[PDB]
Amino acid sequence: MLRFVTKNSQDKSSDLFSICSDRGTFVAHNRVRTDFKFDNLVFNRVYGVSQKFTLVGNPTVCFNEGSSYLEGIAKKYLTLDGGLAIDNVLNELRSTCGIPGNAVASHAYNITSWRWYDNHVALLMNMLRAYHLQVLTEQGQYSAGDIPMYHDGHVKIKLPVTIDDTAGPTQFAWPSDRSTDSYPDWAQFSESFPSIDVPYLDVRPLTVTEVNFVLMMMSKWHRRTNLAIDYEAPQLADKFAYRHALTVQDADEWIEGDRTDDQFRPPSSKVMLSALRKYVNHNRLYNQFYTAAQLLAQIMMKPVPNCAEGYAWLMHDALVNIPKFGSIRGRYPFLLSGDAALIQATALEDWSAIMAKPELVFTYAMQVSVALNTGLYLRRVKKTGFGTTIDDSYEDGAFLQPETFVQAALACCTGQDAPLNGMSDVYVTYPDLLEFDAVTQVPITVIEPAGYNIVDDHLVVVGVPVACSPYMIFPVAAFDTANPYCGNFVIKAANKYLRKGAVYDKLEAWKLAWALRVAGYDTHFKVYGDTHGLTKFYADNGDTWTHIPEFVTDGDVMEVFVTAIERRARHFVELPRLNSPAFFRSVEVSTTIYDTHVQAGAHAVYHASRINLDYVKPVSTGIQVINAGELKNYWGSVRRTQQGLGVVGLT
Amino acid sequence: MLRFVTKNSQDKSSDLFSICSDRGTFVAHNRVRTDFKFDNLVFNRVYGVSQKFTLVGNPTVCFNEGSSYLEGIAKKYLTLDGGLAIDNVLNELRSTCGIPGNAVASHAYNITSWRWYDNHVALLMNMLRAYHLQVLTEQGQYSAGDIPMYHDGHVKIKLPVTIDDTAGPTQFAWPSDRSTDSYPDWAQFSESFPSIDVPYLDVRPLTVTEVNFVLMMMSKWHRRTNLAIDYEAPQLADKFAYRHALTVQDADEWIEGDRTDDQFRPPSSKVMLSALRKYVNHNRLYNQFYTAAQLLAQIMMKPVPNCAEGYAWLMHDALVNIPKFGSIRGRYPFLLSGDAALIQATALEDWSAIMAKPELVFTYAMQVSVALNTGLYLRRVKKTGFGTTIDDSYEDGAFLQPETFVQAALACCTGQDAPLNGMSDVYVTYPDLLEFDAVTQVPITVIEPAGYNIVDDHLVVVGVPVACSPYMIFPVAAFDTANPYCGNFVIKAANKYLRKGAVYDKLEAWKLAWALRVAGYDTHFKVYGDTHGLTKFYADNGDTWTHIPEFVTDGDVMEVFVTAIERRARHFVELPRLNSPAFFRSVEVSTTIYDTHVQAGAHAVYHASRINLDYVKPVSTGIQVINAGELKNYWGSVRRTQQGLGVVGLT
Amino acid sequence: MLRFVTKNSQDKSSDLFSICSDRGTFVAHNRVRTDFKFDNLVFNRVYGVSQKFTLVGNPTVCFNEGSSYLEGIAKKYLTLDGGLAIDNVLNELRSTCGIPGNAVASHAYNITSWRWYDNHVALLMNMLRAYHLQVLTEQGQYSAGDIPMYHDGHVKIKLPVTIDDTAGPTQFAWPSDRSTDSYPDWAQFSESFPSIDVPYLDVRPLTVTEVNFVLMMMSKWHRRTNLAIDYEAPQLADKFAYRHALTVQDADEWIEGDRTDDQFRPPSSKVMLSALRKYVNHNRLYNQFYTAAQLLAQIMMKPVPNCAEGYAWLMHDALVNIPKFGSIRGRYPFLLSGDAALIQATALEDWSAIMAKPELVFTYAMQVSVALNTGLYLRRVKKTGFGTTIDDSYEDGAFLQPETFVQAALACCTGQDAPLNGMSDVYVTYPDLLEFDAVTQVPITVIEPAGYNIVDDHLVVVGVPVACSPYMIFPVAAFDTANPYCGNFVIKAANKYLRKGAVYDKLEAWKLAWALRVAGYDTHFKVYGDTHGLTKFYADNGDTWTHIPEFVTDGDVMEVFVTAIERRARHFVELPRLNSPAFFRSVEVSTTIYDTHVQAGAHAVYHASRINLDYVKPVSTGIQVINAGELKNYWGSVRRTQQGLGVVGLT
């Protein structure tokens, strides 16, 4: 995860940001320059680029029983593999502490059928997202959330959202509702051994206030706003025990009715994060913590499009599968002692980096949200044999496995290694979008006949709509040739010339039209088929990115005929008609980002935060750090190879 | 910084000055003798050329986290490639405090061992700035800032100041206003194991008075005057602890009625400087101070515009970005034990230089204000080349980044390698001039409209004006050709003569017009294009400099008219009619300085304090000095090249 | 410490002395001879030299939490480093003694958060200083203390001291005041394991009377006299337990009111020292004992000057930082068993030597008091590039670290290795004197106009005033050339001759004038600057040491012009004008001490005691003696090298 975000910057200083939102949306800006060279002549044009996002979403969160992960407990009470060494724990009771042989023998007889399920991903997920929510309320940016309306001049579209951002809550409150729902049976535990199969949480080193917060995050979760990470969840455990130096009542009183809603308010994000840092550090759930932060960042937000067609992306919701809650670390007072076992080297590297820089999760989610939408959109164009020298069925391959679905989209576009969740049957997918022909119905207020699709006030779209800009990860190149996604490319000779224009290959034309528009010229074309919504390479102001022509997504049309290239209203670099045999010259255009930032609303400007990797080194003391992890639990990122994108071990 | 102002040790010696001002403005007088060689004879003249400087300026300074710098720690825990050895640090407190076995590290981590944000370039700024303010108070010059008005017979210029001078203060008092604002929660700590994630600064060796001043420089700052270095600031920290054998409360007493305003007054600049030096020397922040002294100097004082056309630059308030305050050097005492690791050889040179000779910072800031102002105007040309260079082959692309920005201007006007900031995301820049073709307006009065082109009391200007003269950094090096900035140049006449024999190249007429104005004849000219009323070269009296008209840079004109030259009221030397044939004899023009000195207000002069090199030579004893350094944390210098210029590391 | 005191005597028999004082002062005398050779002619002159000291002082003693030092406990219950092996101690309870597994398991659960702080430096400090105080009362020299008045003939000065030596106490009484302050909660403990986090002291092998003394030294300490080692301190522990064979009541009764002030009087110095020897030996606190005796000797006394300027040294007080009291050795009856671990080889070597010769601490403090004042004074002159071939900023270097401050002063002058404290955040410094320009206001009764500084009845002084004589450490040489501090030197040719006298280098002149005065001649001079309080190399009777000329402390004046050298009232060796080209001859003068002693008052004569190092060998039985100790805890003395004085490991 961290290794990924820093790779997108070519490892050249990663400038991240923290959470911020204006009614559920924000935008990033990058001062970028593009050069134009021909016969030794260079012309640079700097402009302002921007791309807005939206924390709002309604993810369908499912909760099912997962696998037991005891990879954080002492090496002394675990087998060479996950399995719990009961015989060693039973002996430890009579040998180290004061317990009779008959007392331990009886407990061992009772402890028989007991299923030792340990999964804190669900709870950690809440504590983390509840932190993000508090951070927004802390910044005074906590609202009910809303979607920005898309009006251009030919039509308007405002996505309907179930809750009004204007009457709603300005304060992040306890998700568990007072007086409307029941609560879990919690109780302080300080005995030498478990008496019930119920989940045992260990928070001995935590502060009284921090514990109250974990008990609150362990209760029911009610979706009060529209933000995606605000998904509604049930109470993790119907009943359980918590290992701590004493008994806690401060939250119990609030549920009893005695305590006032004021006297018991959601603690600050610092104490919220310190309770999460203290918890995962003590229980050594680093491996499980990595899975939670990974899944929460994947559905954190979605990049808002500047076209009606792209709004179909915000129309669909993500299907996530979160493992039910399980805890056994607090069953014994010596389970989290000794040396931590089976801790991943990546999980620790990421964990310590997320602890020092919580912004990393937010910045990572933003990079993933855009690299996902593009990697999915590129899936259609790439399968068209477009710019791809590797022939494969992107169509059904890697997007058929739930855990690797989201990763195949990123690696497909970014070209890098997409980090896996590090678990099984845990993921964030868009099942209804696995189909290439999959259509979407988006409600629009027709204003004009320019033409888009129309039926009963909403227009039809197929597959994933290019919505975001490739500027939040400018080095990305969804191809194996020099193109706009690339750092630089050259516009070559139209393979054929004539009287009204010149023909070009599907790619060569877009490559030209893109750098052509940025140069202040409108590119017109005419292909041999019809399902071009229109003639003229579309590109929009703000990011000035000439989107890849839709028609090329439809195969067997391998050539395009670009005609009449007339300069636009605002002209920057003067240039050669190029589609002319005479006026043509080879031109190399290079785009590079000089400064990137983000701003929410009209007054919040956020400067990119820096993180020193030399300082953020993880602590390997008391930890058994492993560099090799098998695939079934899905350790290791997936990447695109010459043979095609597939899963591979971390190593 | 030191290498910059002196000229990398040339002839090796140095005479600099110290802060002093008349209501926020002083003057740099120079006595020079210009020679006129022609006819195998050399005529000349001696005179007085002064250049005013206004320390007044309202800088819009903001603060946000900058990557932590842990250079000021023991080499035992900080490696170059091994980065931070966190495990080694926790492997220490195990044998130093009441923690049993392996419980220690995990305990220390949970609370503080994960943050480590260190940075002291917020406090160092205040102590250094408040020192400059205290010195003027001691010298009897602490008064508000007031921009001197410009009256050139024609149009006068007056600038608005948000606080009056006369009825203002006369003594620099504590920036923090008691009875009005709140204060940072502080307390002396000595626990071998910190219990709260919060700033921890080491001042153990400092005296009670010196410590008080640190907590006073740590508290909220209130801008009382118009001077640039008095930039309004908040309290570096909301809560923190300091390591010291005693608990200083002289400041706490004054925080209430107990300690009276009188008996707590700001300590002498000698005590402020001695406490500042001890603080940096103790923890070892040499690298952090280098950058702190760099920013405050770049924002220090501006050059008072000798011409009205050069007044538009004065109104621009540079946006400065200082990092937030974070401390990690008082967390534990064993941190500062041993050889200070990874310390820049340059930051040490300056620390050893400015500590012994604090005057340098001021003299350096003075050179940077004129060099920046001149390098900004030169960029306008260099890129276009007076319309000789067709494309943008000048590569001024560095002016984009705010950090390399100010350095780029200096490196543009001088072959000197502009000193970087030594930190990332920190800087002082004018974003309102990113586009060198930048236009600006100016509030005007009236007096006969002549080549002034005004618009309803608003003087329109392009790029940046020439608000001052060379001399302070005289052997300049702005034009690869001989000229006034260079020091000497000659007169080869008109390409062709006419009725009045007026024909020269844009700079050839300016070369002669500048030298003619000196001798005693303001030369008249003509341009059939819009001269907006311009008929003769302009020259001020205080600063007898003749500027290159904006039309001599408009790129529309190449050839020039010099209708005739006329005998001025005050005449010096004597000369032939070179603007006509049969009389023109080339003249070699070179001017040298007899004596330079600085005098503010008007009473008692100041004779430069010569600063030679090797008495400053630092002692590497007990320190790990590093000559190299990346480019990520900004360490190196922007340099001028044969294409344009580019950023290069210190190597 | 011991290795140091014996080095000052060139290892040629160390003659030490014990404590003694006449109203807070004493003086040392040394029969010394100086030889004069030229053209094979030798003339020796023997005289009586003396230098008085003063035990009186008012050190500002601060008490702060320090580090835990368990380096004296059995190797069986300690990790490879300081850390306490709890698991081994817990097992030892159920395995060796009779305790149930449930009883030990419960105690282990309670013993959880417990901080194991162990620091007896504060208590040991009291027991030692209280011994010195009893020794004086035992010798009948116990008084309220006072400072000797300095009257010469031109002015008089008597330093004001808060308590009258004449009405005051003649007997050393319990510092803890009866009926005016509360007492700590002490209680006999003989259980197998701790029941409370409170400090547990172990004094099982001590006698009932000795224990009462430790309980008294563990209570509050009231400063009844003016002696420096009489500093006022609070009650080490508010409550605690002591491990002994039985319960003690003899001191409890005195606090209850039943016991009479007579029946309960402070025991003799023998039983006081036997209680300290028994305590440190049993608890094996040798390492901690070394730190206490080290700090107490550093502030023990100050050498009285024979000039008004030198009295500024007695004007300032020392800032010491003593670690709060902590004890855990008495928590278990087997903690001080087995083999002592992590005991320093120097601490044991010094401890056994201080046990056989308590005088060592007093003699050592006297050597340090003079070698400190001179090393600090030499700091100014040495930084002037005077006689120093090594160029360094003595100014801020080593005197910025609290723990090494006092050591850098000794090593700077003595040239030997200055032994460190052997701990952290523990020291004795003069913060207000770290400044070179630091001024002092000394109250004087002007009598004459001879000239010194004057303002409102007190004269101004800057930096450290040469007060003591280099005879209490005659081999010392604060230079790298042959000089008075040296064993012998030669007066060479004035590098230049003329009609009224001869010029000499700053050193060569003082070298001459010093041996010139001892020869019965007054040396007059005239340098090119003015801030010479007067003309004529000053030297005073008693020690007849010609003090290094103040003016030379001010740089850039590298030459002195010695004129008119006329013989003094009392003439000894006839000699050559020497500043004459004709009468000049190379003369080698050698000074050597033949007999040194000390006498307090008018009748107390003390003969130098001798110590046989072959007999005083330390016991290594049952002890784990380590010869290597790291710097963070500050083990190893600091010394002046060719690269400059810096810290170095003992080895």
UniProtKB/Swiss-Prot annotation, chains A, B, C:
It holds the Pfam family LA-virus_coat. InterPro entries: Major_coat_LA-virus (IPR015302), Major_coat_LA-virus_sf (IPR036332). The modification N-acetylmethionine is found at M1. GO terms for cellular component: viral capsid. Acetylation is necessary for viral assembly. It is found in: Virion. SUPFAM superfamilies: L-A virus major coat protein. Capsid protein self-assembles to form an icosahedral capsid with a T=2 symmetry, 40 nm in diameter, and consisting of 60 capsid proteins asymmetric dimers. The capsid encapsulates the genomic dsRNA and the polymerase and remains intact following cell entry to protect the dsRNA from degradation and to prevent unfavorable antiviral responses in the host cell during all the replication cycle of the virus. Nascent transcripts are transcribed within the structural confines of the virion and are extruded into the cytoplasm. Binds and removes 5' cap structures from cellular mRNA. Forms a covalent bond with m7GMP through His-154 of the capsid protein while releasing the mRNA body. Belongs to the totivirus major capsid protein family. This is Major capsid protein. It comes from Saccharomyces cerevisiae virus L-A.
